[PDB]
Each structure stands twice: as structure tokens, then as C-alpha cells.
């Protein structure tokens, strides 16, 4: 148990009651350092470990697709924690008021949470800390190398992050010890009432018939294991050569599970490393799941304004500002962008895939966010438009990967300066003709009418 994984947010009188794990990011029972450390703290005090998960007033900003995925996995997680003699409690309200009241009504001895770098979690922590006196710990249960330990500053490129992370990989890439067992209404009720509130906001194709297709990704820890095994056995060999072809789904499709913490990324990394495949495909996949995923936490953790023009690199701010007054080829409102009402059939196909499946191909994720920059009055409104559609419609959205990916596409964050254009300046450019050379755009457009 590496102590560099756990940080202290409040040092108080170490309480005399159950250690409470505040699940936020990692919604799984296996391979969870926050769950394995809380048990270790529990055993050192002879008190049973418990889990509390808060259902917040911020789900109504997303849709049914995200609400169902999370709650269905929780129903499976609740059963799993029961079989390990850990009781799971679910509260519906403000985490600051709900958690503070809970630790008092149950005589919590120690409080543990998993690590999110997002602004909304720092908001919740501010409230809880001001109303509790027991010690408050957090564990990075989502990154292979803990976010604060990998780097002490914000990195400007991946070629600088890849040595700093791989030099610490032997310290932190290791097997999970098992979760030894211990010595506010039903979830189905909450799913029922939540669906009703969100229902008249459901995305609808034309009229009546809804747009989302929930049969693409089953939620839960067990489904994620089947996904990862199917990727390694069937899709890992050709990852490095086919990841950039949207006509073929040769990606791991792990992001909906990764975002909700329904499978630990290190569990993925251990099995990839031990498996024989195309060595280049292994090299390409490991870079995405270790370098680019864990640098996204670094961007969000070390930039308080990660979702604004303020966090862009200086060369990109200077270039974009010099082109704010250029004429734009087209301008679309958010409502037009949502429905896929653009003059680009490649963009409209990309939007239609997101609406239908809640997951959009990683390659077109760059084209789709750069045309938003090309068709917006200012880069600021483009950042808002890109954030709005991503968080609303992506299964894996509302994630540090999303903001880092969007900041990469719009402001060149973790990228370099390129040849100047109008409107977009030095930012990397992706043309309609360029995508035709790399993959058969005809099938992708037809597949999503
Ligand atoms: C503008 C934009 C927005 C994005 N929004 C999100 C998002 O909200 N949530 C999200 O999880 N990913 C986002 N992605 C990152 C990336 O596209 C997805 O991780 C990936 O496409 C998800 O599908 P996959 O699991 O089949 O990827 P795979 O090719 O199978 O890679 C596996 C994992 O590596 C990680 N990864 C892969 N590519 C990237 C990347 N470019 N940056 C960071 N991590 C990466 C992902 O965690 C991914 O799950 C975004 C990318 C861009 C360019």
C-alpha cells in the first residue's frame, strides 16, 4: 500500500466510529485504492468500513442516457458490496449538507473520498470540510501514478509528460490486493423518479421516437470486464493501425466505463502489458490510456480555468486574438449545432453518431470540435458550444478527458503551433478533404443519416 496515493485535506481528532468512504469518481468494488485504503484504515481501528454515494442536484443538466448508465451500475455495485459485507448508502441532495449530517448521525471515525480534479468536486469538498471535525483523506483511485505525484506543475506537451510518468510506473503499476470483507430508499425508486424529471428533455428524432440507443454499452463492472477482454482478444492487435479509421470500431470502447470508474484503468494497463500483440499497437494504446488520460487530470488539476480561454497557451491566445475580426465562413447557433444542421455532411454524421449512441469516434472528436471553432463568433462561444454538447450527450463526458480534449482541439493545449490560417490562426487544421485521404468518409456519412 503506497502512501503516496493518499493525501490529507483535513487533520482532525481521529474519530471513534465507522470509516466512511465517500464514493465520487470510482464506482466499483474491485481495484479501488480508495476502497482498499479505507479498509486498511478500518482494520487498524477495528471498525467496519461503509460506503456513501451522494446523488446530486446536478444530474438534471445531463440526460437519461447518463443517468441510467450510472444508476444501473450502482444496482450491481450495491449487490457486490453486500457480498463483501459492506453496506452502501445513497443520499439525494447537496453533498455538503448530506455528508456533514451523515458523519454526525453515524459517528464517523474517518472520512475518505476518491480524487476528482473537477471544479464541482472542489466545491463539494469546501462545504464538507467546513462542517466536519474528523480527519478527511482522499486517494487517487483513478490514475496509475497519482496526479500530484506524477508532476508538480502543469505540463505543456505529452513529450514532456511521457518520461515523468514512465519513470514512476514501476513504483505504482502493481497488482491489487483483494478487498477483504468486514468482520436513502431503494435505487430503483431513485431511478424511477429521476427518469420522470428528465423525460421531457429526452432527445427525440423528429417526433415521439427517441434518439438514444442503449443497447451499445451495457453498464456495470461485469460488463466492463467483458469489454476489456473482448478488446484485448479481438481488437488490440490492430489498434495502432486502425484507431484513426471511423468506419471500423477497432477502439477499446472503454471510456463510458472508465469515466464512471466502472473499471480501473490500471487493471486495463496490467492486462495489456502482459499480453502479446502487435508491439506498435500496444505502444499506441498504452499512450492513450496512460499519457493522454492522466495528463487530462493534470490539465484540470493544475489549471483552475481549464474550461476557459484563460488556460490556453500564450502562442494560441496571441494567434486567436489576431483573428477575432476575420470573417467566418459560417455561423451556427447552439440549437443548429445540436440538431446537426450544418453545411458539412461529415460534421452532421459525427453529431448524429453522438446523439444515437452517446459515444463518438475519437478521430472525428477532433474534427467536430475544430469546425465549432471555425463556425463561431469568438473562441469563447466555441468553447461553450463544444462543452455544452459534449457534457450533455457523451456517455464518457463531464470528464477531465473531455475538457483536455476540447482545449486540445480549440486552443492547442498540449499541442504545437502550425501554419497560420484565418479565423483559426496557428491552431491545427483538419479539412474535409484531409479526412477523405485517411478513411472512407462515404460509409461513415451513410451509417449516420
Ligand atoms: C474534443 C474531445 C473531447 C473528448 N471528450 C472526452 C470525454 O468527455 N471523455 C473521455 O473519456 N474522452 C474524451 N475524449 C478523449 C478520447 O476521445 C476518448 O477517450 C476516446 O475517444 C473514447 O473512446 P475509446 O474508449 O474507444 O478510446 P480508446 O482508443 O480505446 O483509448 C482508451 C482510453 O484512452 C483514453 N484516451 C484515448 N484517447 C484520449 C485522448 N485523446 N485524451 C485523453 N484520453 C484518451 C481514453 O480514456 C480511452 O478510454 C475526447 C476527445 C476529444 C478530442
C-alpha cell at 197: 424529471
Tell me which residue has its CA closest to atom 16 in ligand 1.
Answer: 362
Q: Are strands 136-139 and 6-10 parallel, antiparallel or unpaired?
A: antiparallel
Tell me which residue has its CA closest to atom 49 in ligand 1.
Answer: 255
Residue 207 among known ligand-binding residues: no
Count of CA atoms in the C-beta half-sphere (13 A) of 290: 28
Residues with CB under 6 A from ligand 1: 243, 251-255, 258-259, 288-289, 292-293, 296, 362, 365-366, 369, 390, 394, 396-397, 399, 401-402, 405-406, 408-409
CA 15 to chain centroid, in Å, comes to: 33
- In our burial notation (b when 16+ CB lie closer than 10 A, e otherwise), range 365-393 reads bbbbbbbbbbbbeebeebbbbbbebbbbb
Taking alpha carbons only, the member of 99, 66, 90, 76 closest to residue 29 is 76
Given resolution (angstroms): 2.3
Tell me which residue has its CA closest to atom 19 in ligand 1.
Answer: 255
Alpha helices in 109-250 (DSSP H): 119-129, 147-150, 158-166, 169-172, 187-198, 221-234, 239-242
**Beta carbons within 10 angstroms of residue 316's beta carbon:** 21
Residue 24 · residue 116 · CB < 8 Å: yes
Taking alpha carbons only, the member of 85, 143, 88 closest to residue 114 is 143
Distance set, CA 78 to CA 50, 97, 274, 340 (Å): 12, 23, 31, 39
Q: Please, after which residues is the chain broken with C–N above 2.5 Å?
A: 183
Residue 277 among known ligand-binding residues: no
Q: How far does residue 39's CA lie from ligand 1's centre (Å)? A: 32
Taking alpha carbons only, the member of 375, 376, 371, 340 closest to residue 355 is 340
User: 80 burial class (0-12, 13-18, 19+ CB within 10 angstroms)?
Assistant: middle
Amino acid at each position: 500500500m503506497n502512501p503516496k496515493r493518499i493525501r490529507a485535506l483535513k487533520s482532525g481528532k481521529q474519530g471513534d466510529g465507522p470509516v466512511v468512504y465517500w464514493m465520487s469518481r470510482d464506482q466499483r468494488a474491485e481495484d479501488n485504492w480508495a476502497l482498499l485504503f479505507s479498509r486498511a484504515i478500518a482494520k487498524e481501528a477495528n471498525v467496519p468500513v461503509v460506503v456513501v454515494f451522494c446523488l446530486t442536484d446536478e444530474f438534471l443538466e445531463a440526460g437519461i442516457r447518463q443517468y441510467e448508465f450510472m444508476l444501473k451500475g450502482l444496482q450491481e455495485l450495491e449487490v457486490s458490496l453486500s457480498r463483501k459485507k459492506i453496506p452502501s448508502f445513497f443520499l439525494r441532495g447537496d453533498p455538503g449538507e448530506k455528508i456533514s449530517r451523515f458523519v454526525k448521525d453515524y459517528n464517523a471515525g474517518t472520512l475518505v473520498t476518491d480524487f476528482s480534479p473537477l471544479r464541482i468536486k472542489n466545491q463539494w469538498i469546501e462545504k464538507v470540510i467546513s462542517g466536519i471535525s474528523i480527519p478527511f483523506f482522499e486517494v487517487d483511485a483513478h490514475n496509475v501514478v497519482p496526479c500530484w505525484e506524477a508532476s508538480q506543475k502543469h505540463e505543456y506537451a505529452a513529450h514532456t509528460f511521457r518520461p515523468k510518468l514512465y519513470a514512476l510506473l514501476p513504483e505504482f503499476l502493481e497488482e491489487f490486493p483483494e478487498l477483504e470483507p468486514n468482520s436513502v430508499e431503494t435505487l430503483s425508486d431513485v431511478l424511477e423518479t429521476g427518469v420522470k424529471a428528465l423525460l421531457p428533455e429526452r432527445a427525440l428524432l423528429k417526433n415521439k421516437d427517441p434518439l438514444f440507443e442503449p443497447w451499445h454499452f451495457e453498464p456495470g463492472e461485469k460488463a466492463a470486464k467483458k469489454v476489456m477482454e473482448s478488446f484485448i482478444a479481438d481488437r488490440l492487435d490492430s489498434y495502432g493501425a486502425l484507431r484513426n479509421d471511423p468506419t471500423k470500431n477497432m477502439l477499446s470502447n472503454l471510456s463510458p466505463y472508465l469515466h464512471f470508474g466502472q473499471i480501473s484503468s490500471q487493471r486495463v494497463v496490467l492486462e495489456v502489458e502482459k499480453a502479446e500483440s502487435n508491439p506498435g499497437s500496444k505502444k499506441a494504446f498504452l499512450d492513450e490510456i496512460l499519457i493522454w488520460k492522466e495528463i487530462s487530470d493534470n490539465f484540470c488539476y493544475y489549471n483552475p480555468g481549464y474550461d476557459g480561454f484563460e488556460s490556453f497557451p500564450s502562442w494560441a491566445k496571441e494567434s486567436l486574438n489576431a483573428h477575432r475580426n476575420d470573417v467566418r465562413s459560417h455561423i451556427y447557433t447552439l440549437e443548429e449545432f445540436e440538431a446537426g444542421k450544418t453545411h458539412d455532411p461529415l460534421w452532421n454524421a459525427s453529431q448524429m453518431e453522438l446523439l444515437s449512441t452517446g459515444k463518438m469516434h475519437g478521430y472525428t472528436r477532433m474534427y467536430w470540435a475544430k469546425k465549432i471553432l471555425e463556425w463561431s463568433e469568438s473562441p469563447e462561444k466555441a468553447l461553450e458550444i463544444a462543452i455544452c454538447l459534449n457534457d450533455r450527450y457523451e456517455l464518457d463526458g463531464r470528464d477531465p478527458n473531455g475538457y483536455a480534449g476540447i482545449a486540445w482541439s480549440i486552443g492547442g493545449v498540449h499541442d504545437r503551433a502550425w501554419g497560420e490560417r484565418e479565423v483559426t490562426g496557428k491552431i491545427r487544421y483538419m479539412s474535409y478533404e484531409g479526412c477523405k485521404r485517411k478513411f472512407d468518409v462515404k460509409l461513415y456519412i451513410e451509417k449516420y443519416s
